[PDB]
Amino acid sequence: GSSGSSGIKQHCRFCKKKYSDVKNLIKHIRDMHDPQD
Ligand SMILES: [Zn+2]
């Protein structure tokens, strides 16, 4: 069919979980996915 949205919500890459608000995600990333690189 038509090309609308490909899933507004974002999905972590490290844990590969589901999140509603992007804001929460970002924080979550550096929260647990904080590599000492
Ligand atoms: Zn994550």
For residues 20, 21, 26 and 27, what is the CA-based torsion angle, rounded to 10 degrees? -100
Elucidation method: NMR
Query: What is the distance between the alpha carbons of residues 4 and 1, in angstroms, rounded to a whole number?
Result: 9
Q: Are 24 and 32 in contact (CB under 8 A)?
A: no
* Residues, Cβ < 5 Å to ion ligand 1: 12, 14-15
- What is the residue extent of each domain of the chain? 9-37
Cα of 7 vs centre of ligand 1, distance in Å, is 17
- Where do we find the tokens 């804001």? 23
The binding site for Zn(2+) consists of 12, 15, 28, 33
Structure tokens at 31: 């929260």
Single-letter amino acid, residue 29: I
Cα of 36 vs centre of ligand 1, distance in Å, is 16
Cα of 13 vs centre of ligand 1, distance in Å, is 6
